[PDB]
Each structure stands twice: as structure tokens, then as C-alpha cells.
Design a binder for this molecule. Structure first.
Ligand SMILES: [Zn+2]
Lengths: 108, 57, 59
RNA sequence: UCUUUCUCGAUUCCGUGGGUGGUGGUGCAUGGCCGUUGUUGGCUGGUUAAUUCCGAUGAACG
């Protein structure tokens, strides 16, 4: 399911639609412009890892859970060439640009 | 008397205070450019919007 | 564009240039209303030279 | 700048160099360009005593 999400996050980087960071993710969520959300499973502080799906359910937004954050961060383009490797724990794709159909039928 | 440059207070998880569990713990800016996420600073006597700079008491 | 190209080795990103070449009030009235004896050489005379002498061996 | 948080988000900021240095100052060679060592022609506006004031508005010969 990760390989069918990598291309849609890549075209999100192409079309600049995705919002990296928790605050930009929430800003995409409450403006009702959001399309889907991606949450890292490695979250030490627990009060925000439960808030993201609460906001997603309040705004009827689908969610994908990924095990890693630094791998998610280098997929969403938080690295430069890679010397510096920093990652994000949550990112909301606001709008897209084949496997996006696979993801949206996996939601159903 | 050397002038030290100001350093921003790096507060841990500044986002994790305006919500519960759902609702908005702080109210919303009623402006045209500001709203649906532009949260309202609530100081001990007064209220601040960080983009359009409205003064609410 | 050109005719001699990559041919090998891992193009990373997709080089977006389409946005560069083709690119080329109550608060008003509110702020309108808001508009209207010693030194280093003398102290050397203080030091004495007759206290801590080592015991002398005579000839 | 000192309090209290709101927002912009990668446009980043902290340390150490006897390593250079650059919005630096300074001379030489160096390419262009001035000045330097005759002759005959040719009015919307306000304003003042006033063709007053401001304000718009070319040529040949040796
Ligand atoms: Zn506002």
C-alpha cells in the first residue's frame, strides 16, 4: 500500500499541494480543502497522534498510517542532495495532480 | 552594553493547545482573509489576530 | 531545449519550470481615525629585601 | 530591546579555523568619448503698470 502512496505523494510534490508539518496539516484540515492525511506511527508524545484522526473524522478526511517518519520525510522532500535527513510525523495532501484510484478504493 | 539579538522562544508543540481529544479551544478571527484556522491569541485582557492585527478587548 | 540528453543515472526530481517562464475596509477608516597615589613604579619601593633569606653556607 | 502569545514556514542559524577573503583602498598596460592646441540666414491657465511672471510649446557657405 506504500508503493501506491509514493506516486501520489510524488505528484503532490510536483503540484505543491501537500502541506508538511502538523500546523499546516491542521490548517488544510479545518479549511475543508484537505483530500487525505498521512500520519507516522512513531509518535512518542501521545496527545497529538490521537488528535489528527479526530480532526480527520470531524472533517471526514481519510488517513494513512506509515511506520516511519524520517523515511516519510525523505519521501515528501525534506532532504537535499542526501546529507541532511529530517522527517515529518504528519502531512496532509490537499489536492492531487493510476494508484490514486487504488488508494481511494482502499479507503472504501 | 552590546546589543544581543533576540531569540525566539522555541516552545514545544505550539500547535498542541488549541484543540481537545474536536472543538476550537480558542475562538476564530472573523475577518475576510482570516478564519477557519487563523486562531485567536488570548492574553489576560485582550485578543489578537496574528495576520490582520485586529484589536479585541 | 536541446538534443543531447541524460542517457543514464537516476534523474531524481522532475524540474518544474512552468511557473517561471510563463509568469511574465473598516480597518482603513479605523486606522484613519487612529491617525488623528601608587603606580607600577612607585609601589616597587614598598617591597623589602631582608626577610626570607636562605641560610648561608660559609667558606 | 523587556513581558504575554498569534502568525511566515526552509527564504535556515549556532560553534571552531592563523585557510582564503570582498559593496574594500591602491598603481601599471589597456579600448572608446569630450574640450583643447570663420561667414550668412531663421499660447489653455492664472499673474503684472507693462509683448510682466511662471506655466504647456531650423538651416546652409567656405
Ligand atoms: Zn485576522
Amino acid at each position: 500500500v506504500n508503493t501506491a502512496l509514493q506516486e501520489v505523494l510524488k505528484t503532490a510534490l510536483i503540484h505543491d499541494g501537500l502541506a508538511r508539518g502538523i500546523r499546516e496539516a491542521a490548517k488544510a484540515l479545518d479549511k475543508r480543502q484537505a483530500h487525505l492525511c498521512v500520519l507516522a506511527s512513531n509518535c512518542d508524545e501521545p496527545m497529538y497522534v490521537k488528535l489528527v484522526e479526530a480532526l480527520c473524522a470531524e472533517h471526514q478526511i481519510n488517513l494513512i498510517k506509515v511506520d516511519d517518519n524520517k523515511k516519510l520525510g525523505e519521501w515528501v522532500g525534506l532532504c537535499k542532495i542526501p546529507r541532511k535527513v529530517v522527517g515529518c510525523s504528519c502531512v496532509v495532501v490537499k489536492d492531487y495532480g493510476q494508484a490514486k484510484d487504488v488508494i481511494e478504493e482502499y479507503f472504501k | 552594553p552590546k546589543k544581543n539579538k533576540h531569540k525566539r522562544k522555541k516552545v514545544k508543540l505550539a500547535v498542541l493547545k488549541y484543540y481537545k481529544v474536536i472543538s476550537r479551544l480558542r475562538r476564530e478571527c472573523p475577518s475576510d482573509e482570516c478564519g477557519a484556522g487563523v486562531f485567536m491569541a488570548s492574553h489576560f485582557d485582550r485578543h489578537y489576530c496574528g495576520k490582520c492585527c485586529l484589536t479585541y478587548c | 531545449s536541446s538534443v543531447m540528453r541524460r542517457n543514464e543515472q537516476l534523474t531524481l526530481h522532475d524540474e518544474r519550470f512552468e511557473k517561471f517562464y510563463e509568469q511574465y475596509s473598516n480597518r482603513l477608516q479605523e486606522v484613519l481615525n487612529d491617525y488623528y597615589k601608587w603606580d607600577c613604579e612607585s609601589i616597587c619601593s614598598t617591597y623589602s629585601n631582608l626577610y626570607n633569606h636562605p641560610q648561608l653556607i660559609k667558606y
